[PDB]
Design an enzyme around this catalytic site. Structure first.
Site, PDB file in Angstrom:
ATOM      1  N   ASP A 141     -11.705   1.982   3.985  1.00 20.92           N
ATOM      2  CA  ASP A 141     -10.897   2.925   3.306  1.00 20.92           C
ATOM      3  C   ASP A 141     -11.333   3.829   2.477  1.00 20.92           C
ATOM      4  O   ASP A 141     -10.968   4.851   2.140  1.00 20.92           O
ATOM      5  CB  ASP A 141      -9.758   2.016   2.654  1.00 20.92           C
ATOM      6  N   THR A 166      -1.662   2.593   3.376  1.00 22.40           N
ATOM      7  CA  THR A 166      -0.842   1.794   4.562  1.00 22.40           C
ATOM      8  C   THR A 166      -0.091   0.620   3.627  1.00 22.40           C
ATOM      9  O   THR A 166       1.042   0.182   4.280  1.00 22.40           O
ATOM     10  CB  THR A 166      -2.033   1.047   5.099  1.00 22.40           C
ATOM     11  N   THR A 167      -0.444   0.468   2.619  1.00 20.90           N
ATOM     12  CA  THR A 167       0.361  -0.658   1.610  1.00 20.90           C
ATOM     13  C   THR A 167       1.526   0.094   1.206  1.00 20.90           C
ATOM     14  O   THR A 167       2.919  -0.308   1.067  1.00 20.90           O
ATOM     15  CB  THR A 167      -0.320  -1.375   0.490  1.00 20.90           C
ATOM     16  N   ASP A 189      -5.291  -4.850   2.486  1.00 23.13           N
ATOM     17  CA  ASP A 189      -4.816  -3.598   3.052  1.00 23.13           C
ATOM     18  C   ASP A 189      -3.688  -3.714   3.960  1.00 23.13           C
ATOM     19  O   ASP A 189      -3.566  -4.906   4.684  1.00 23.13           O
ATOM     20  CB  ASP A 189      -6.068  -3.136   3.943  1.00 23.13           C
TER      21      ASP A 189
END
Ligand SMILES: Nc1ncnc2c1ncn2[C@@H]1O[C@H](COP(=O)(O)OP(=O)(O)O)[C@@H](O)[C@H]1O
Ligand SMILES: Nc1ncnc2c1ncn2[C@@H]1O[C@H](COP(=O)(O)OP(=O)(O)O)[C@@H](O)[C@H]1O
Ligand SMILES: Nc1ncnc2c1ncn2[C@@H]1O[C@H](COP(=O)(O)OP(=O)(O)O)[C@@H](O)[C@H]1O
Ligand SMILES: [Mg+2]
Lengths: 526, 535, 537
Positions: free
Chosen positions: B399, B101-102, B68
């Site tokens: 997540d 988030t990536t 992540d």
């Protein structure tokens, strides 16, 4: 090789003298003016200053950049103090005061190298400044139809230009509407401590909001806060300054007991002291409890069984805003609780904005305060958004008590050069080279509106000096189009006291740099 | 000159100006792009279901393999203030939504790479930043075109499972791609308040213990704590538990103040023995009068109180944490009682199979709560083969717990796999000609940077970026634009509606909004005032 | 990513501001040594040598510089000595103020190529205006033009007395070395005047030796040190013993032939000394060396022999006395002829007393009547200052006699060009008019520096200076105010035509051409790359 005495002068001190001292002070103010030169105008960039600890602070305000440079020059500290006083008096005169005061020294820099004892320059600077601050007051427009919708539109146009040159591009119509609505909810004191600006990491600039009540950050609680649900349609708030713990000790009590029958009576009395305070909060409708002192595990579970909410360790700055929001009063002693000291709201929930929980109050019509929750993508992003919010608040704070506004941009700074060049041609002596040099120094405010984006700034000043000498007096520099434009019709407004305190602080700083002839520095630095 | 005047005087402005660094130039904007592109090129290989993980080593020597984007940039030692803003950008996506988030770092590095060629053409950096705001506004309004969900949290959990499979498909939990996806769906709906659309993650306890396998991860409705039976002959299985939750230690009552109790005669010392002997018989009888057969205590036990538990057949645990017993009173429906005198039958909790389970050769013996009655608190017990696969599964399933929370906040979805980025890139290109006055080049740089995220999925899947993206983008113009993306094994056709690649609307809505505002704060900067050496 | 050079790179307005401060670091030094109210400086070396001077060339040559923009202004002062010779404080102040006003233009986002092209339109117009507004050539004033132009150069130095002692010695020195050339060129070579220094009496005892003053001694103390009606024999070969060359060796096979070869080394040597002395020659000058054996033949015959003279001094004596510089034997396979009709002539060769040294003087030389100046000062620091001030005074009268045209000094040229170029910038000025307007303000620094060093009024005296020059250009009523300058002893504008403040034309024409050309090269340093010093590898 010259000074070799048996007893020296003071210890080892070096001191410059005369004309090389004065050019050393003028050229030092030119270097520190480059740190606020690229931050002027809507096409002006920001700057990032890193200290020795590694803390990054990105900003474009003159009161923020100049305080982080750590300038140790004696003459260059004068330009930092006028950027601090502009934030303390106006709030949005900052980069313009530092850069205009450096031009007052650079326009007389070829004059101080060739004679011209500086008492003539101080007398000419004080003469041109008093005529400049009087022509602003004689041309600043005002209205006689206030307390209507037209006065609110005047406050919004002054806040959009105050939010200009910040880190806000398309959110001018959204943020500046909230700045005007923030100060109109306040009382007739305009205190900056009556509005909370809290930064919540996560979310865009459109996710920000102006809470009509207050909201605190939901600090460290105990076991029992996963209970006590946050659904209240008409709650009452009990603002307290007392400890709700079992270990409330006066730190000097020695309970000497003699028998075991009276020993159990003391331990039962310590629970009866705490439970009597909780019965005073109960049976009064106060479903929400707020206290700046911590609450232990006993009083947390008591309110969960009675279906009551509490919040301990609240900061004192938040309880002062909470008192003016709900209209109650903070009671240190719980024995005097009544209906006149409790608060009243409509919506009290604990949301999940940005991951962290926030207990927000809403619905109270007698709200003398507000809370502006900021949402951004970085900690330095919200600090710049908070710093840009304080500049728009302090502009609209001064605009209520003085609604006399002038045109924005370089419209006022160009027409003051017209009235001063016409005044310099009517007086004889050496003041024609000083009043006219004071008028040419005021033309850098439309220069930095153009030099930050090209715009062919040499040709655009020939159009400004021709338009002000022929027609209107509010023609300035357009930012979207590379041409001159009427800033009064384009709603580029600013209050008149922003430029009055800018011309006053820049002239008194420029009169201080030209008045010092010797600089003695002692070598003892420990 | 520097550090000297033209008259020979020393020219010192700021302190230690010889060891300073200042860049305004034209390379100050160039140094921000080359520092941000290297972060985006690092995170480009960890995007999509074929994204390879990264091995992170801490300062203490601990190694954590993370995929992540939030934990990767946070555990770096990057002393660069431009790349530090990319760390807070991935942290802001994790705090608000927690799924992209990536992708929010590759998108921010794509907007700065397209702005590098626009900077050489003479465009002002704020003019590019003002052009990105007019271009990102088209991407927000076009993303709200096709969005619908039929979640009712009763029997239509099929859109909820397929939404969590998109989040868990890129992690290392693809062996439990159907098992662990159903865990995160039922863990949210049992603790969420549907009347307020608010989900509290404090009710979802995520615990982990080494041993077993990834398929042994079960959703325990209740609580899982470290059982600390003070008596070794305590019964390790309770069929019907009347749980008596208390916060008072099994001891004679000690006050909070200084006492210094005085003993004068031998009749007062014999009164001390009868006071404590009747106190341990009072604290035990007041639990048995309520009908309880299980006790929970936050503080310690006395040795005299331990044998009185075995004589009265009352199992009890010792030294439970702060928020651990807060989860017991919600899962069992009981109340936390401060004293022993306030115990009653109404403040007792109800639970079914209360037992401790030993894991192999260890001595942990965690609590397992099988049966309950309308609990609002669940506990996920993650097992694995090592601590690297468990701490990642704690980050992977978190997540998956966030994307179900975003569906209760907003019940509108989109279709991922690069399908929403290609469709949003066509909306900016259609509005770039209406009108191409000033910001025509700034909007086309936004549409060329939105195509970096689907072409990074084609690079990690072994395909060609410009060959696969030209085929998918042309099919959305010749007809009405469907949910058309890509995949790794490609599942036959490229229809994302048939492959069930479902992402949240507000997840991708905050990916374009946060990356545009972070680009505006790193384009509107023309100076760096960093120091030199450390000391 | 960036450039991988191992040096240092600085772009933008950093070097554009550093070159102006590099030029102002040199101009602020020499600003205190301009005009009659200018003051000298002290140049102390690390070894202890002290040099007291005020000339713009001697200061900047000994001063060490590091900046590349600083070496342009230092080499600009060295070119003024060869081209003109006194114009070498005024060029450095103008060329640095040309960069100071052009820096204010490039900060207004004006392109520097318009400033370079704007300076060329103002520099060529300044030479055009100064060549059409001269007063008169050297026919009306006569000898009063040469004396008044000499006193203007000496006013900034140690020889600026109220009298005309040093002024008359310079004019009488240049007028005595009038050397004609082909196609009607009356050249005046001022390098032929031997300027000598001696710590003696005051400056009013500086002798004007009509002839030449040789700086050497007689050598042997048996020769007559005063020869009346002397015949100078100028020759350049060492009068030592006959030493064979490298290709010739003496390999003797007979011991009886040993002593005849040893005596032959002195017989061939004395054979030359008897045929140059029997022709009536009394003074022999030699650039080589006369050993102790050959000094006997001059003591015995009563002749003067001067050994180890300079080669540059022998050419000035042989051309002025009609002597022929002979190096060897010649004239068509002759043994020893010497061409005795080509001996020099002199009225009197006398070695006088020059305060504990020996100095040889030649009186009027009977052929050309040259001149040499012997200076007299208090110490050696004044004598080095008197030599530099006299050499700059010789270059002033050289350019006036060659180019018969003078301009009024004391800021009269810079006042007329400050107003003509402002009207010139308004006629044909569209985008380069701001560079021509700043060319006029840069030229005003020459009368501005005269008011600072005199401690007079600055912004009022120069304002009164250009008030007369403005009425001389816009009011055509024959006001004749083109020669209005500055009276630094009183603080009022005066007429330089009657006051006698005259300067040559090319002391300002070549000054404005060299300062404008130097300002172009320093205006094109927008990018600068400085590499690391490669010393120890
Ligand atoms: N819409 C606009 N058009 C033209 N100029 C503007 C506009 N908005 C702001 N400006 C100019 O930008 C400048 C910003 O000055 P600022 O840095 O806020 O001063 P201070 O530092 O004192 O607050 C103002 O002087 C104003 O003239
Ligand atoms: N089955 C699939 N087919 C095509 N693309 C997929 C599939 N599953 C996941 N993806 C893509 O992989 C990407 C993974 O993004 P991710 O790194 O999880 O974002 P974040 O870091 O914000 O959680 C998603 O943008 C999605 O479009
Ligand atoms: N009597 C005088 N009155 C006014 N000015 C004078 C007088 N004598 C000399 N000056 C000025 O002093 C200046 C001396 O310049 P100088 O330093 O000699 O130039 P350079 O270094 O090229 O020789 C001249 O430009 C001249 O105008
Ligand atoms: Mg994912």
């Amino acid at each position: 090789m010259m000074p070799t005495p048996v007893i020296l002068l003071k210890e080892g001190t070096d001191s410059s003298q005369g004309i090389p001292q004065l050019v050393s002070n003028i050229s030092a103010c030119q270097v520190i003016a480059e740190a606020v030169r690229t931050t002027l105008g809507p096409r002006g960039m920001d700057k990032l200053i890193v200290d020795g600890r590694g803390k990054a602070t990105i900003s474009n305000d003159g009161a923020t950049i100049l305080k982080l440079l750590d300038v140790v020059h004696p003459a260059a500290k004068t330009l930092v103090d006028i950027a601090k006083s502009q934030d303390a008096e106006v709030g949005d005169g900052t980069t313009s005061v530092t850069l205009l005061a450096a031009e007052f020294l650079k326009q007389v820099k070829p004059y101080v190298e060739e004679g011209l004892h500086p008492q003539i320059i101080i007398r000419a600077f004080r003469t041109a400044t008093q005529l400049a601050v009087n022509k602003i007051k004689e041309i600043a427009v005002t209205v006689k139809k206030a307390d209507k919708v037209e006065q609110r539109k005047l406050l919004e146009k002054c806040a959009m230009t105050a939010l200009s040159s910040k880190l806000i591009s398309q959110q001018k119509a959204f943020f500046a509407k909230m700045v005007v609505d923030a100060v109109m909810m306040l009382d007739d004191l305009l205190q900056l401590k009556m509005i909370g600006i809290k930064k919540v990491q996560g979310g865009a600039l459109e996710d920000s909001q102006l809470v009509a009540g207050v909201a605190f950050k939901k600090t460290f609680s105990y076991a029992g806060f996963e209970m006590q649900p946050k659904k209240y349609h008409n709650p009452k708030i009990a603002l307290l300054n007392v400890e709700l713990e079992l270990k409330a000790e006066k730190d000097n009590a020695e309970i000497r007991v003699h028998t075991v029958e009276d020993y159990q009576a003391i331990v039962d009395a310590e629970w009866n002291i705490l439970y009597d305070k909780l019965e005073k909060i109960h049976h009064s409708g106060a479903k929400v409890v707020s206290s700046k002192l911590p609450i232990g595990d006993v009083a947390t579970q008591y309110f969960a069984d009675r279906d009551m909410f509490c919040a301990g360790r609240v900061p004192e700055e938040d309880l002062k805003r909470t008192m003016m929001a709900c209209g109650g009063s903070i009671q240190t002693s719980v024995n005097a609780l009544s209906a006149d000291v409790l608060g009243r709201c409509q919506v009290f929930e604990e949301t999940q904005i940005g991951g962290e929980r926030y207990n927000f109050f809403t619905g109270c019509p007698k709200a003398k305060t507000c809370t502006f929750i900021l949402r951004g993508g970085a900690e330095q992003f919200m600090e710049e958004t908070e710093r840009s919010l304080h500049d728009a608040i302090m502009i609209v704070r001064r605009a209520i008590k003085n609604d006399s506004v002038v045109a924005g941009g370089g419209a006022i700074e160009m027409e003051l050069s017209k009235y001063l060049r016409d005044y310099s041609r009517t007086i004889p002596g050496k003041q024609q080279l000083l009043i006219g040099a004071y008028a040419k120094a005021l033309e850098i405010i439309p220069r930095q509106l153009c030099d930050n984006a090209g715009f062919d700034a040499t040709n655009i000043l020939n159009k400004l000096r021709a338009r002000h000498a022929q027609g209107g007096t509010w023609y300035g520099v357009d930012i979207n189009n590379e041409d001159i434009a009427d800033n009064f019709e384009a709603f580029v407004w600013e209050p008149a006291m922003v430029r009055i305190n800018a011309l006053t602080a820049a002239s008194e700083a420029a009169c201080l740099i030209v008045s010092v002839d010797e600089t003695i520095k002692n070598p003892r630095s420990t | 000159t520097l550090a000297f005047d033209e008259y020979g005087r020393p020219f010192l402005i700021i302190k230690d100006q010889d060891r300073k660094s200042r860049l305004m130039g034209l390379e100050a904007l160039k140094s921000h792009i080359m520092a941000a592109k290297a972060v985006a090129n690092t995170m480009r290989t960890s995007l999509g279901p074929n994204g390879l993980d990264k091995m992170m080593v801490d300062k203490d020597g601990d190694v954590t393999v993370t995929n992540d984007g939030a934990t990767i940039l946070s555990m770096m030692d990057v002393d660069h203030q431009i790349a530090k803003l990319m760390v807070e950008l991935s942290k802001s996506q994790d705090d608000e939504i927690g799924d992209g988030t990536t992708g929010v770092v590759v998108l921010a590095g794509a907007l700065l790479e397209e702005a590098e060629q626009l900077l050489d053409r003479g465009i002002h950096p704020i003019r590019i930043a003002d052009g990105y705001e007019q271009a990102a506004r088209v991407a927000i309004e076009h993303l709200d075109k096709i969005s619908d969900s039929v979640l009712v949290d009763i029997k239509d959990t099929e859109p909820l499972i397929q939404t969590a499979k998109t989040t868990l498909g890129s992690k290392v939990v693809n062996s439990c791609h159907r098992q662990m996806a159903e865990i995160a769906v039922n863990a949210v709906l049992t603790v969420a308040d549907m009347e307020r659309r608010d989900v509290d993650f404090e009710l979802i306890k995520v615990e982990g213990k080494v041993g077993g396998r990834l398929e042994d991860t079960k959703l325990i409705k209740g609580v899982i704590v470290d059982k600390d039976f003070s008596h070794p002959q305590m019964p390790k299985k309770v069929e019907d538990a009347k749980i008596a939750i208390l916060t008072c230690p099994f001891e004679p009552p000690k006050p909070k103040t200084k006492h210094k109790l005085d003993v004068t005669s031998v009749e007062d010392y014999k009164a001390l023995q009868k006071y404590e002997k009747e106190k341990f018989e009072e604290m035990i009888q007041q639990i048995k009068e309520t009908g309880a057969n299980l006790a929970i205590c936050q503080w310690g036990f006395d040795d005299e109180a331990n044998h009185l538990l075995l004589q009265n057949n009352l199992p009890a645990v010792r030294w439970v944490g702060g928020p651990e017993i807060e989860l017991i009173a919600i899962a069992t429906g009981g109340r936390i009682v401060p004293r022993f005198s306030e115990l009653t039958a109404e403040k007792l909790g109800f639970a079914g199979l209360v037992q401790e389970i030993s894991f192999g050769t260890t001595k942990d013996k965690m609590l397992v709560i099988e049966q309950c009655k309308n609990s609002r608190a669940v506990t996920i017990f993650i097992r694995g083969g090592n601590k690297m696969i468990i701490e990642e599964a704690k980050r992977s399933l978190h997540d998956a717990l966030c994307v179900i929370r975003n569906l209760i906040r907003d019940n509108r979805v989109v279709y991922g796999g690069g399908a929403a980025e290609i469709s949003c890139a066509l909306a900016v290109s259609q509005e770039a000609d209406k009108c191409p006055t000033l910001e025509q080049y700034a909007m086309r740089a936004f549409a060329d940077a939105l195509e970096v995220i689907p072409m990074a999925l084609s690079e990690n899947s072994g395909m060609n970026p410009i060959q696969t993206m030209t085929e998918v983008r042309a099919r959305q113009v010749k007809e009405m634009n469907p949910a058309l993306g890509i995949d790794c094994l490609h599942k036959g056709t490229n229809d994302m509606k048939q492959q069930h690649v479902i992402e949240t609307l507000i997840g991708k809505k905050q990916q374009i909004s946060l990356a545009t505002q972070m680009v505006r704060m790193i384009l509107k900067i023309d100076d760096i005032r960093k120091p030199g050496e450390s000391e | 990513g960036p450039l991988s050079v191992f040096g240092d790179r600085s772009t933008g307005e950093t070097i554009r501001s550093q070159n102006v401060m590099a030029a102002a670091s040199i101009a602020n030094i020499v600003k205190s040594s301009l005009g009659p109210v200018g003051l000298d400086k002290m140049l102390v070396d690390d070894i202890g040598d002290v040099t007291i001077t005020n000339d713009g060339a001697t200061i900047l040559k000994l001063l060490e510089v590091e900046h590349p923009a600083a070496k342009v202004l230092c080499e600009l002062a060295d070119l003024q000595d060869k081209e003109v010779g006194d114009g070498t404080t005024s060029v450095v102040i103008i060329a640095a103020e040309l960069l100071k006003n052009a820096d204010e233009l490039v900060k207004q986002k004006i392109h520097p190529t318009s400033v370079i092209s704007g300076y060329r339109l103002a520099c060529k117009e300044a030479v055009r205006y100064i060549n059409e507004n001269l007063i008169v050539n050297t026919d009306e004033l006569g000898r009063d033009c040469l004396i008044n132009a000499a006193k203007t150069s000496m006013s900034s130095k140690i020889i600026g007395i109220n009298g005309d002692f040093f002024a008359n010695m310079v004019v009488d020195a240049v007028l005595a070395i009038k050397y004609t050339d082909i196609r009607g060129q009356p050249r005046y070579p001022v390098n032929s005047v031997n300027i000598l220094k001696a710590h003696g009496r005051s400056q009013m005892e500086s002798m004007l030796i009509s002839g030449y003053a040789l700086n050497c001694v007689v050598g042997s103390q048996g020769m007559p040190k005063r020869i009346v009606n002397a015949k100078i024999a100028c020759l350049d070969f060492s009068l030592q013993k006959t030493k064979m060359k490298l290709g010739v060796q003496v390999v003797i096979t007979d011991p009886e032939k040993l002593d005849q070869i040893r005596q032959r080394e002195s017989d061939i040597t004395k054979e030359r000394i008897q045929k140059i002395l029997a022709t009536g020659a009394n003074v022999i000058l030699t650039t080589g060396g006369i050993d102790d054996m050959c000094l006997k033949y001059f003591v015995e015959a009563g002749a003067m022999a001067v050994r180890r003279v300079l080669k540059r001094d022998l050419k000035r004596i042989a051309k002025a006395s009609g002597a022929t510089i002979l190096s060897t034997l010649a004239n068509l396979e002759g043994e020893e002829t010497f061409e005795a009709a080509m001996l020099g002539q002199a009225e009197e060769v006398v070695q006088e007393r020059i305060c504990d040294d020996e100095l040889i003087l030649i009186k009027n030389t009977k052929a050309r009547t040259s001149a040499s100046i012997i200076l007299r000062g208090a110490n050696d620091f004044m004598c080095d200052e008197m030599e530099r001030s006299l050499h700059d005074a010789l270059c002033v009268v050289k350019r006036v006699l060659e180019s018969k045209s003078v301009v009024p000094g004391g800021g009269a040229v810079e006042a007329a060009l400050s107003i003509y170029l402002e009207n010139y910038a308004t006629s044909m000025g569209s985008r380069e008019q701001l560079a021509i307007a700043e060319f006029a303000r840069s030229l005003l620094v020459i009368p501005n520096t005269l008011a600072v060093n005199a401690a007079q009024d600055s912004t009022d005296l120069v304002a009164k200076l250009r008030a007369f020059h403005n009425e001389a250009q816009v009011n055509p009523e024959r006001k004749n105010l083109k020669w209005i300058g500055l009276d630094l002893s009183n603080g009022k504008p005066r007429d330089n035509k009657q006051a006698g403040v005259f300067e040559p034309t090319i002391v300002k024409v070549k000054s404005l051409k060299f300062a404008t050309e130097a300002a172009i090269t320093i205006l094109r340093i927008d990018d600068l790359i400085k590499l690391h010093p490669e010393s120890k590898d």
